[PDB]
Amino acid sequence: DVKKGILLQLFGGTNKTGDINILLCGDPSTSKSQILQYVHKITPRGVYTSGKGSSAVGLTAYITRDVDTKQLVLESGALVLSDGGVCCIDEFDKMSDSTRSVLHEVMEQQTISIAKAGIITTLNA
Amino acid sequence: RIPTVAPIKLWLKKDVKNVWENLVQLDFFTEKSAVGLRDNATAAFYASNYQFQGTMIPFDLRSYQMQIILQELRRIIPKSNMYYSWTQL
DNA sequence: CGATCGATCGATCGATCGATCGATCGATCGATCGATCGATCG
DNA sequence: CGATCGATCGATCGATCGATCGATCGATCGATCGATCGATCG
Numbered sequence: 001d002v003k004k005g006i007l008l009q010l011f012g013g014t015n016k017t018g019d020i021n022i023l024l025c026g027d028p029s030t031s032k033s034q035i036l037q038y039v040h041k042i043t044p045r046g047v048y049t050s051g052k053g054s055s056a057v058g059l060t061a062y063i064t065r066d067v068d069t070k071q072l073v074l075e076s077g078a079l080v081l082s083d084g085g086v087c088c089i090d091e092f093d094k095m096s097d098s099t100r101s102v103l104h105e106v107m108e109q110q111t112i113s114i115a116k117a118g119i120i121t122t123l124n125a
Numbered sequence: 126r127i128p129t130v131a132p133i134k135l136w137l138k139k140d141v142k143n144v145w146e147n148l149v150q151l152d153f154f155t156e157k158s159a160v161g162l163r164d165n166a167t168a169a170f171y172a173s174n175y176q177f178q179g180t181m182i183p184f185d186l187r188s189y190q191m192q193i194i195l196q197e198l199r200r201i202i203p204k205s206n207m208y209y210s211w212t213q214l
Numbered sequence: 215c216g217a218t219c220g221a222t223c224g225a226t227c228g229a230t231c232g233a234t235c236g237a238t239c240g241a242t243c244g245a246t247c248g249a250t251c252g253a254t255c256g
Numbered sequence: 257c258g259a260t261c262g263a264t265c266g267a268t269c270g271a272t273c274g275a276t277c278g279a280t281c282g283a284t285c286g287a288t289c290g291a292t293c294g295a296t297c298g
């Protein structure tokens with residue numbers, strides 16, 4: 001059953017004018033890490049992430065404004081690099097609450113809206 | 126939930142007493158720790174000698190427990206009943 | 215005409231102390247059950 | 257002579273509460289960044 005669903009994760013749904021997400025809960029000795037290592041090494045441009053190894057601006061691209069051309073620029077992010085791919089998150093429980101909070105919009109609407117001083121825009125992830 | 130019109134009874138607390146008395150007798154309710162029918166004559170003697178607090182405290186403050194749990198009510202109560210929608214919490 | 219430190223004040227993050235809360239150990243009286251017994255009359 | 261009853265005391269179930277502790281959510285003081293410009297220098 002683990003094999004089928006994770007395979008079904010790679011097949012994916014069908015976007016129309018689609019992504020499938022999976023959580024592995026189990027005792028800390030059973031094959032959890034090995035499958036995720038395989039997935040990002042078998043999918044194009046996957047990103048390997050962990051709880052304390054990332055931040056709120058780790059998955060979210062750091063949007064800033066240019067100092068000379070004054071345009072809006074983005075410096076990439078984990079959830080932006082893997083657009084259309086699969087992102088592997090280890091220790092998903094130990095994710096910080098702030099970092100965990102921004103998942104809701106990403107997982108359901110596939111967007112990251114940011115409202116800060118001088119910048120008001122939304123991304124696609 | 127019934128909209129007001131531009132220009133159901135809440136029965137009085139005294140009238141509800143008869144309804145409460147009816148339900149207490151039909152064993153839908155029961156007193157908090159009601160032993161009920163004693164087993165032997167000596168137990169009945171000691172029970173009739175004693176005066177329980179539940180029989181002394183006012184009619185409005187006697188503690189009761191329920192025999193038909195709300196889930197059983199939702200099983201039994203017809204859905205055509207007006208109050209059926211409240212068989213859920 | 216261009217390159218390098220400086221001071222300021224808004225904006226953002228975060229880490230640290232603290233406010234808030236579920237749990238257990240110790241206690242106890244409210245409610246009750248039965249035994250004791252002194253009192254009453256056939 | 258004994259048979260009936262109303263009161264009292266000891267004991268126990270249980271429903272409850274206070275003192276104490278570590279754990280969860282949050283306010284907020286401190287660190288850093290940034291943006292334009294200015295003073296010294298070539």
Ligand SMILES: Nc1ncnc2c1ncn2[C@@H]1O[C@H](COP(=O)(O)OP(=O)(O)O)[C@@H](O)[C@H]1O
Nearest residue numbers: 026027028029030031032033034035036037090
């Ligand atoms: N069903 C299994 N099939 C193959 N290997 C397994 C299985 N269950 C446990 N293992 C072994 O146990 C080890 C567990 O490591 P891993 O799953 O990577 O991290 P964790 O110890 O946190 O689960 C792996 O090296 C793996 O070889």
